[PDB]
Structures are given as C-alpha cells and as structure tokens.
Design a protein around this motif. Sequence first.
Motif, short mmCIF file in Angstrom:
data_model
loop_
_atom_site.label_atom_id
_atom_site.label_comp_id
_atom_site.label_asym_id
_atom_site.label_seq_id
_atom_site.Cartn_x
_atom_site.Cartn_y
_atom_site.Cartn_z
N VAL A 1 0.96 -1.18 0.08
CA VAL A 1 0.19 -0.04 0.03
C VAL A 1 0.59 1.59 0.01
N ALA A 2 1.84 1.09 0.24
CA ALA A 2 2.65 2.59 0.57
C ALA A 2 3.98 2.29 -0.52
N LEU A 3 4.18 1.25 -1.47
CA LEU A 3 5.56 2.04 -2.05
C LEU A 3 4.35 1.90 -3.44
N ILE A 4 3.54 1.86 -3.79
CA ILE A 4 2.26 1.78 -5.22
C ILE A 4 1.62 3.41 -4.45
N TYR A 5 1.79 4.11 -2.73
CA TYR A 5 1.58 5.50 -3.06
C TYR A 5 3.14 6.69 -3.40
N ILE A 6 4.54 6.12 -2.76
CA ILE A 6 5.08 6.46 -3.86
C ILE A 6 5.16 6.81 -4.79
N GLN A 7 5.07 5.02 -5.23
CA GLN A 7 5.65 5.28 -7.30
C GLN A 7 4.86 6.13 -7.39
N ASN A 8 3.62 7.58 -7.28
CA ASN A 8 3.23 8.21 -8.25
C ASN A 8 2.74 9.24 -7.05
N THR A 9 3.53 9.64 -5.88
CA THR A 9 3.49 10.79 -5.14
C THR A 9 4.98 11.48 -5.68
N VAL A 10 6.18 10.76 -5.38
CA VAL A 10 7.13 12.00 -6.08
C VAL A 10 8.06 11.05 -7.38
N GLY A 11 7.36 11.18 -8.09
CA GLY A 11 8.39 10.95 -9.75
C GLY A 11 7.89 9.48 -9.74
N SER A 12 9.53 8.14 -9.27
CA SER A 12 9.38 7.07 -10.00
C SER A 12 9.90 6.20 -9.24
N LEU A 13 9.76 5.17 -8.55
CA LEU A 13 10.27 4.12 -7.61
C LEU A 13 11.24 3.43 -8.25
N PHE B 1 13.89 2.86 -10.09
CA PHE B 1 14.98 2.86 -10.03
C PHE B 1 15.90 3.71 -8.60
N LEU B 2 16.26 2.56 -7.51
CA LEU B 2 17.27 3.43 -6.29
C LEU B 2 18.43 4.30 -7.18
N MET B 3 18.53 4.20 -8.10
CA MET B 3 20.12 4.99 -8.40
C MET B 3 19.28 6.42 -8.53
N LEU B 4 18.13 6.19 -9.00
CA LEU B 4 18.12 7.71 -9.17
C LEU B 4 17.42 8.27 -7.68
N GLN B 5 17.71 9.12 -7.05
CA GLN B 5 17.26 9.03 -5.62
C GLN B 5 17.83 10.54 -5.74
N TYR B 6 18.65 10.98 -6.39
CA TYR B 6 18.51 13.00 -6.75
C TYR B 6 17.90 13.68 -6.36
N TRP B 7 16.87 13.56 -6.59
CA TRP B 7 15.73 14.05 -5.87
C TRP B 7 15.12 13.43 -4.86
N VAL B 8 15.42 13.84 -3.64
CA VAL B 8 14.65 13.56 -2.22
C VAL B 8 14.11 14.49 -1.14
N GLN B 9 13.16 14.36 -1.11
CA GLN B 9 12.27 15.48 -0.04
C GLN B 9 12.61 14.47 1.48
N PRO B 10 12.32 15.41 1.93
CA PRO B 10 12.23 14.79 3.24
C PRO B 10 11.17 14.56 3.80
N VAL B 11 10.77 13.94 5.01
CA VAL B 11 9.00 13.39 5.47
C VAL B 11 9.19 14.46 6.84
N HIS B 12 8.46 15.34 7.10
CA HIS B 12 9.05 16.08 8.63
C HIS B 12 7.93 15.82 9.65
N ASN B 13 6.77 15.45 9.55
CA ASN B 13 6.01 14.98 10.82
C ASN B 13 4.62 15.48 10.07
N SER B 14 3.91 15.14 11.12
CA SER B 14 2.42 14.25 11.13
C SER B 14 1.12 13.48 11.22
N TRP B 15 0.56 13.47 11.49
CA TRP B 15 0.04 12.19 12.03
C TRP B 15 -0.84 10.85 11.13
N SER B 16 0.22 11.46 9.40
CA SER B 16 0.46 10.43 8.48
C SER B 16 1.22 9.92 8.49
#
Lengths: 113, 49, 50, 71, 53, 458, 344, 38, 138, 96
Positions: free
Chosen positions: F162-174, F176-191
């Motif tokens: 449920v989570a990895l399909i949540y990232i795939q369509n959130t930031v770019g494309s997962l 490839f690992l070898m491209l993380q050269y764009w990664v924003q952080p995770v600050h905080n929430s209850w999500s």
Amino acid sequence: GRATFQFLPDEARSLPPPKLTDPRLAFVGFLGYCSGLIDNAIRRRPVLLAGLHRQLLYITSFVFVGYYLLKRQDYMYAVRDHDMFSYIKSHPEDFPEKDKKTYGEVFEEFHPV
Amino acid sequence: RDHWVHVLVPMGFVFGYYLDRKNDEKLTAFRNKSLLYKRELKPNEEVTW
Amino acid sequence: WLEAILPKTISLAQMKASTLVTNQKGLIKLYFLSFLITILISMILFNFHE
Amino acid sequence: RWIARTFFDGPEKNYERTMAILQIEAEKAELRLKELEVRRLMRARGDGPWFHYPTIDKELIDHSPKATPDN
Amino acid sequence: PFFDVQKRLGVDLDRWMTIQSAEQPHKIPSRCHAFEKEWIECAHGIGSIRAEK
Amino acid sequence: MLKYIIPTIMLMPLTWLSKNNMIWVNSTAHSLLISFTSLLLMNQFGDNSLNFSLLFFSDSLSTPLLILTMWLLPLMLMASQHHLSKENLTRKKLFITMLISLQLFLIMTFTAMELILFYILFEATLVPTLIIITRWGNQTERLNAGLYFLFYTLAGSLPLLVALIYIQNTVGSLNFLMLQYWVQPVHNSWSNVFMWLACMMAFMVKMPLYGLHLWLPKAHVEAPIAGSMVLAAVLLKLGGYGMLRITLILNPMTDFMAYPFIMLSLWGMIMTSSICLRQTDLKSLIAYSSVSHMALVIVAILIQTPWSYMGATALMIAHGLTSSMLFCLANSNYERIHSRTMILARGLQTLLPLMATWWLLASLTNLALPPTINLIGELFVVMSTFSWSNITIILMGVNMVITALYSLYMLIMTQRGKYTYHINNISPSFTRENALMSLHILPLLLLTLNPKIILGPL
Amino acid sequence: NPIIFIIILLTIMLGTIIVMISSHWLLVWIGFEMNMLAIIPIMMKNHNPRATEASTKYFLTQSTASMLLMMAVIINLMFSGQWTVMKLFNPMASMLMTMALAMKLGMAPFHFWVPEVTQGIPLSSGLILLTWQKLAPMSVLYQIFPSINLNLILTLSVLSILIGGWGGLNQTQLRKIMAYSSIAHMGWMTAVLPYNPTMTLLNLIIYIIMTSTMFTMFMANSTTTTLSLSHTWNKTPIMTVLILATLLSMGGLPPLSGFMPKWMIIQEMTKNNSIILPTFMAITALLNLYFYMRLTYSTTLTMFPSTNNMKMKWQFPLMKKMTFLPTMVVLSTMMLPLTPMLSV
Amino acid sequence: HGSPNWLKVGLTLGTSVFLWIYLIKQHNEDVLEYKRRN
Amino acid sequence: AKTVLRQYWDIPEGTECHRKTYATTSIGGAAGLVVSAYSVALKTPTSFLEGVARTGRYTFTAAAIGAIFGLTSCISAQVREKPDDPLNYLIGGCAGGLILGARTRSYGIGAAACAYMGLTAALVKMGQLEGWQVFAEP
Amino acid sequence: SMVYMNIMMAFTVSLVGLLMYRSHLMSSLLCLEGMMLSLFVMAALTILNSHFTLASMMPIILLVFAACEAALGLSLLVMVSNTYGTDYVQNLNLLQ
C-alpha cells in the motif's frame, strides 16, 4: 479503438511486427511445453515421454497463438501513446516549460545527526 | 549418446554472456561526458560500443 | 503473555464463524423477514436517497 | 595488469553507461506526472476524449411535418 | 459490456421505440414533443459529463 | 545478470533429465562450478557502483552478500542426503527442484535495481519454503509451523504495497534506486508516522524484534531433515537488509520515533539469550542464538553514522556462517541418536575424536576471539553506538558475558563420561560428516586475511 | 431428451446476449427474465427431494429480484420519460436498482441464498453455470456506472468480502466452500466500480477462469473434504500437485497470477487518495486464505488412505480444456500489462 | 501396425502447415505495409 | 444522513461540550437499537408479544457507551489543555472497556474494548486532521 | 396527481413477511402473482395520459411474461406438496 469489434484494425501495418526469437514466444508454449508433459502424467501414461503426436501439437498451438496475440498488444501501447502526445502537444497552456536552475539556489533542510 | 546431459549446459554461460553484449549497442546513446569519459578522438570508445 | 495476545485473534474470529452459521439454520420464513429490515433500513439511514 | 584487461572494463562503461540509462528514465518520470495531472484531473471540462460519456443521438430525431398544428 | 452491434452492421433491433419523438406511425405528436427536439439539440456533441452543468 | 540466472535455471533440467542414482553427484558437480561465475565479473567497484543493465545492477552497492547465497546451494545436497535417500526418485527430483527454485530468486533479489522488483520477489519466496517445512517434517507439530510462518511474513508485508504504490505516484518514479537524486524529507504529521511505520514493520517481522518472533523457534525446532532448508532459512532472514536501501533515504529525517525500536530490541538482546540457558532441546538452543546477535543489527541500522555499516555488514554475513554451521553439527549428531534432547547424547568426545575440533571452532566464534570477522564486526558496532550515548556500554557489554556462558555450556555438556547404554553411534563420521562440516571454518576464518571484501560503502 | 438439453443450454447465453446487446430498458428485463425461466430444469435432472426444495428457494429469490427492477425501470419512465440505458435521472430509481439488483449477484446481505442453492443441488456437474449469472448483471452496472449513491455500493461491498470470508472457516462440504468465497470475489470487483470501471473486468475474467478450473478438477467423484484425502493414494498424485497449484493461487501469492487483480486494483484505488479503504479489504482477504490452507492440508499429508480401495481402471470423464487452464491460471503474471489496455 | 485413428493423425500436422503459412502470409504481407504506409 | 454526524462535527469539536456529548450519547444508543431490532429478523424468539422487550434487555446499551465517550471529552474538552491532540480525543475510547465490563462480566472484554475501541478512536480526528479520504474520485 | 399515490401504496403489497410467509405458501405465491397490476396499471397510466403511442404495447408485454413465468413457479409448488400434501413454508430441510 475505432472500427469496433475488430481484433486489430488496418492501421497496425506500420508496426514492426513482433517477429520470433523473442524470449516470450519461446517462453510461450514453454509453459505449454511443461503442459504437454503434464498431459501424460495425469492418467498414469506412464511414459513421461509418450506419443510425440500429443507431446507435440501443443507447442505448435501456443506459439502461433501467443504470436498472433502479441501482434495486437504492442499495437495497443502505441495507440495509447499516440493519443497522448497529440493531446499533450495542443493545450500548451496545460504544459509549462520549466526553467533551469539548481545549485547556488536551493536549500534543503538541513538536518544531519 | 555423447551425453548432451553433461557439460553441454555450461555453454549456457557464453549463451548468456553474449546477451549482456546485445544491450551495449542500444546503451551507446552517450559517448559524451566530462568525467573522462571522453570518447574524444580515439579508436577505443569506438570498440565496445 | 506473548502467546495470549496474538493467538487471541485465532480464538476470537473462529468463534464469530460460529454465530454466522449455527444461528442461521433453516426456516425460509426467517431469511425473508430479514430482507425486509434491510430494504427499509436503507431508506432512513444515509446518502442512499440523497 | 593481466586480468583487468582480460575480463572487465573501466569508467568508459560502468561510468557513462549510467549516463546512458538515465535518459531511459527521466523520461519515465515526465510521463507519469502528466497522467495524474490529466487523467485524475481532467476534469470539469470532460474535454478530451477520456471522461466522455454517451448523451443521446440526434440522428434518430424527426423533422417532418407531423399532424397536429401545435405540439 | 455494451457492444453495440446494431451500430456496426445494418439491423435495427429497437432504437425506434426509444424516445418520445421519432415516428408515431400516422405522424401524431406527444404533448411535450416539441421540447425533445429542443433538449436533444442541446447535448449531442457534448460528452454528457459537462452536460449536467 | 543472465550470466547467472540462465545457468542456474539451466541447472533445473540437469537433474531429472539424468539417470538413476547418478542424480546427486550430477548436480553437486555443476552447482559448485557456478561459483567461478559468481566471483567472475563481480568484485568490480568499489567506487561509483556497478550497474550493468536497466533493471539489474547485480550487486554493486558494496553489499556483495551474493557470493554466499550461491555457496549454500551445493552445500545442501551434501547436507540433505541422510534420510532423504529413503523415498522415491520422482519425489527426490522434486526436492532438488524447489530447492533450486528458491536459489533462483535470491539471485533476482539483492539486485532488483529498484523497490518494486524487490517486493514481489521479497514475497516471492514462502511458496518454496513453506512447501519444504510442511512436507518432510518430523513431528506432527509441523502443521502449525506452516501457518505461523505465514500470517506474519505475509501479514504485515501487504502494507508495503500500500505504501510503495503510494510513493510511485507521489514523487516521480521509484523505478530506480540509483535515482534518488531528488528526495524531499519527511517532517511530521499523524500521517507520516504511519508511512514510516508501514515502510518498516514488514521488515522487522522477518529479522525478529523481541516481540513478534513467536514464529522463529516454531519453524526451526521442527523443520526438514538435514536442516536442508534450515540452512536456507538462516540466509532468508538476514536478507532483510533492504532496510539498508530505504532507511538510508526515503524518509531520512525521522529519527524522532526511533526509540521504541531501540530500547525494545536493546533490552531483548540482553534478554532472549538468557532464556536460552535452560533449554532442553538442542535445535532450540541454537535457534535463540540466531535472534540475539542478529537483533543487534537493528540497533546498528537505525542509528545513522557509519562505522555502523562497517560493522553492520560484517554481521549479516558473520553468523551467516557460524549460525549456519551449528545447525549442521546438531543434525549429524542427531542422525545417530534419534532424540534431539540435549541431555541424551553425553559422553561423546571419546568416541568421535576428530569431531572434537569441529565443535570447538564453532563455539569459539560466538565467543568471537579477536582476530576473526566476528569481533571486527562487533567492534565497529560498539564504537559508533557508544557515541550515541555512553550508557550503551553496559547492556551490550552484558551481552558479551552471558553469551560466553551460553556457548560453552553447549560444548562442555558433550565432555563427560557416558558409555552409558548406547550400542548405536558406531559410525566414526564418514567423510561427508566432516566434509560438509568443513567448507565453513576454512572459508570463514580465511577472510580475515584481506577483510576489505566484506564492508559497506559507509 | 439429449437434443433439447443443447437447446435449453443454448438459450441461456441467448438470454444473456440480449442483456449485453440492447439499448432499451424493456429488453434488459425480458433479457434476464428468461433465465429464471430457462435455468430451472437443469437443477432437476435426477429429480430428488433437495433440488426441488432448492430451485424453489432459488426461484422466488430471483423472482422478486427481477420484479423489483421493473418497478425501478418505470420510475424514470415518469421523470424524463426516456428509456434507453443511462444514469437513472432520479435517486429512487438507482437506490432501488443497485440494492435490489444485488440479489442476483448476491452481495453482503441478500445471501442466505448462495449457500442454500449451491449446497445440495444434487447436480454438481455444473453448477459451473452459476458463473453466467455473475456475468449478466455486471453488464448493466458497467453501463449505469455514473449513477450510484456511492455510499452504498461500497457498503454492500465492505460488508460482503468480510461476511463471505468468515462464512466458510466453519465449513466442511466443499460445494459450500466454493459457494462461500464466491461472495468474496464479489467484494473486489464492485468495490472498485465507480473508480475506473475497467480493472473490474480484469478481476472478472481472472475470476471466471480460476473458479472454472476448480470445478472441472472437482469432477471426478470428489464431494466432501474427507473424500479429498483418499485422493492422492488412489486416483493419481499428478492430481494433487494441481489442486495445490491453484487453491493457493486463488487467494493469491505474488509469483502466481492470483495476485494479479489486487496488484493492479490498488494502483487504482489509491492514486484517488483513498488509502484507508483498501488496507481493510487488502487485509481481510487474508483470513480468506485460511480456508485454502487447511483445505490443502487435506491432500498432501497422506491422510489415512480410504480403506482397501482398488481402482485399477483408467478414466473416461471429459477434462475438456482442463489441460490448459492451470497454465493460464498460474503463469500469466509474468506476461501482462495488457489487461488494463487490452479490454478497455 | 500401430493403431491410432489414422483418420485425424496428420490433421494437426496439416493444420499447423496452414497456420504458420497463414501466419507468415499475414506477416510477410504486413511487414511491407508499415513502409508502404509510412 | 451525512446529517447527524456532520451536524455534531460542525458543532462543538473542542468546545460547547454539552450539545455535542448529548448528541454523541444519544446517537450511540440509536445505533444500538438498530442492531437489537435487526436481531428479530434473522434471529427468532419465544417469549411472545412481550418477548422482544425481554430480548432488548441484552441491548440495554450502546447508548450508555455513546454517552460516556462524549462525556469524557465533554468533561475534558478544554480541560488541562487542548484535548484536540491525537492522543487526546483518544480518551473517550478506553472508558469504553469499563462500560462493557460493567454491562456484563469481567476479564475478557473490558480491556479489549478499552484497547481496540481505544485504538480506533484517534484515527478519526487524525484522519481529517491530515485530510484523509476513504471514498474518493480523481 | 392523486391517482399516482394510489396506486402506489398498493405496490407495497410486497410486504415480505407475507411474501414468503406464513404457511400456506399459496398465499405467498398469490401476493406475488398480484404484485402485477401495481406494475401494470401504474405503467398503464404514465404511458397513456401522455401520448407515447409507441410504448403502448409494453403493457401487453408486462403480462405475457408475468403470466408465463409466474405460472411456471406454480409448478414446483406441486412437487413440494405432491410429496407432502401440505405446502407449509415450515419445510426447511436443506440447511445453512
């Protein structure tokens, strides 16, 4: 798409087609080649190689069909794209050109341990 | 007969090792990089790609 | 006390599959009265008319 | 000296072969950000032939002079 | 899934009884007839999802 | 790459295609050969890691870890041979096939190029393992080990998808690992806690915390003949490394909640080793080692700051062997005497003199004498995890005590006079007994000579 | 006798072909009105005192199921007075459509039926034909698709895949165990349905195959679970690797194809930023698996071969097209990102 | 004197002789169509 | 309909603890009824005309729990601090264990109710608080 | 106007306790075969008061099955009470 209830339309002429020696077509009917070997084994054949007239006519069937079906699949992913760019091209108002800039600009967080 | 069963299988290697050579022709698309990484004038970049 | 809390899930559910089979046995009248509760209770409840 | 030239290569490949396959990539994160900025959100336009629905066919209507003067 | 064969080849299965104004064998109208040819004229080239609004 | 999957799948009809009893030696012969290919193009960089294809970089990563995975296969047929010789050949052809059918995915995994080939191949086992546990068990308690082995592993690894399909369509494309050269952080929430908690807890349920390990001794106590797949299931577990691919990135900046995974497994490390002292069943006694100094990596990984990855990598493959090999001893000594009850076997060391030095070098590498990999894999743990807070020296300093009484009590139980009633135990360890028990201590200690080949990038 | 059985058994699909081909509300009445007319004699064939106390508990439960529909057709004949087939123009229509149409499919409620019929039809032959009646209704719901109250078709879904799950854990007869967990897979395909209604059919075909290849296997003599124990040491062991190569794949595990519907479906149900719905579905089909495990601990554990039972004869059933399906019910995952763009 | 049907045997062979023929009959034709069209 | 619940919410979330709880306490009971009433269609009876009342004796609840949950927040609300925090609107859940315990016997529920009906309270608030959607469209 | 609220209250003839129950099944099956005329008449007005002129056959086709089919399901009710002699909905035998 158009010309409804057609396996494939006339417009598929312009595609390669997907000729043989692709791993799948080989693999297609491989899963049948392990199917034929079953076909004996259920009934206590008990050959594990029985008549080659049953032990063949499968492999003939799959790859033909596996082939004749892959001809349209590759098509479909083309008409998908085709209808995208031609929409992406017009309405350029919905498609901006991003600027160029990175280093000496962006700040990140910045949170080390 | 000649035992096809036996070492005829290791020939799968060079079978495969060739496939890893099938791609390098379609991965050529960059002969240009700044890290040396040259493909500058030589008949070296020309081979292997 | 590690095996009480999680396998409690085992003997939690496996009981609720004894209330969905045992108590439903028979009496074709008894179903049919209960489609009626369901078909009215969809009127009052929610968005269903809205 | 004998082995390195017998088997594998240097940063003429495993460098600037990544250059190669990261243009097989950064065009795959361009076209997954433009679906979800079109497919999911078209929207209220229903403009492009996607969320398009059937309405009614105005071919089968009739223009003839049917009999009653007011209708 | 709605195949719509009667579109491809020629036959009419129904398509005639369908709406309030089509033929009516001797050409006799309905009461609200005149508002059909008005309202269908509105949404045709539409895709019906904007029709409602 | 296909250099590997293709011969190892080519293995598959090297076996049944053969004749009668030639089968074992047929495949054991070849299965060794692939190890030349294993090193062959591998142990390239080093710096600026190797990626040779679109969806595979076999292992570059400095997590070489794959060479072992290709060892343990033709250590099985030397291992598994004992009582599996007593049923039919068309079934014996199976048990060699599914066992390979495992070995094929562990080459696929550890490469995977990405997240989403990992997962479907991270869950792609449990088809081959579950079938080896339930059939060819021994006791009748096995049937429950079948379930418990699922309903955890699968239980919480669905929240991945449920989570990895949540990232795939959130930031770019997962893709490839070898491209993380764009990664924003995770600050905080209850999500976001949940996101971090969903992208994590699936991995923990494999390498156990002191909770939710309730399955680990259930499957090992009762499990196939030789440890035939019990050697493999001590590879599977440590293969939860992928937390090294994530937690390095992809929510880097939540350490906020780390503490319930520290103090929960850090007080279990001093714990479950201590509930291992009074055990009356030997294949249990080893199963609780495997938790302990495995669960030390989970306090190595969560902390950032290498000198942990210097020491966290050496551990995944540290007990990767020692903890493997012990299940190989306790198997053999069980062939002859059919109880697994530890008490019953005593008065050995007279009757099998050569196998004396086999126990010793095994039980000596839980002690971790300084020169071997074991300490040089622990003393990069303590050096960073000390800097975390000075007080970690106590508990994990206690670990270095109870583990020493732990190991010896297993050896020194087999030094006693017992002649007692046994007319069995004649066989003086025919070569396979001591052959397959080697190919561990020879390759293990050896690496200490040039131990830069086991290290992370840091 | 033998001719007509192919006249009847043909008229069924002719009953459901007028359903998918039509423009016109009347015909989708007549269309699946003549199934409840033309199904009934198949149940009978051996004339026993169950089938006849079965098809009569079926009959009047598909009699009203229809006869409400005709009341929710003639509502919007008032309003807008235009038949055809499109959103229903009025809320008392749809809410009287979809929750009175769930009777033929039966969803979360409206099943005290599916176990009372599928059990104890003396005819187990098929009973594969109760995969048609899944396929008639959906070929409405795909058309009406943009009118639903949307708080319902989920509320019959999520109360279904749960209630059909727990239903069986308590069951032994294995005609029921298929009866149950065939409400389940009606939980996934109509939970999707408002979001991108293809990637439903995907789950609809993968379902028609898998449940199909079960029965054709359950046909030799097999009836009760403890008659599947006397199976491997008697009939043939190449049968047992089959019944273990599917029943596992049907709840699904990723190397098989049974994992193919979920894996795709959740691509859809998130991306619409509902992530608190699918876990609870995703996580509930879990204890939908514990039928099959514990079904599969019957046949591979060599449980007390029946008795002295000597079957020296070979077989003469019709396995027709069973020698295909579990190469397409299993191995297809590696193949296809077609199913979303193929049927579309 | 092996006893298959010797009725159908060879149909499956003969049929494949048609299919591959007809397959390539569509293929060797359609290949040029791409260029004829493009 | 969306009605009642929506009404309450767009009412006194953190303040005006009275109307809210009086509502959350009466709605819980209302919900409780539904199930009791349902029990007569699927389950039969045998205590005649008055019997259904007797039956309801077991359902002599839901309402109580609803009341209590609201009451906890009603009592709290502006209490020590903002009871709007994720951990807080929790509190209304657990008292629930005690509620069920009181209703019937002991040790085999009152914790679980306090436990699980505790766990699933916070999410609600936490849900809209990050803007979560269960039923959506593109 | 008013004739559309009668007959409608009539089409709650369903009332389902009296749709399957209680015994003398023939009473249940009866209120079914007269559930029509609430479907018929109601649809014999809306078609009629406005001149559709075309759907006018539909009322005829609402019977021709309503008699054909409902007359089938009578048949079973012989098979039940052939082997018994009393219908009595109270036969449950096939259970779950």
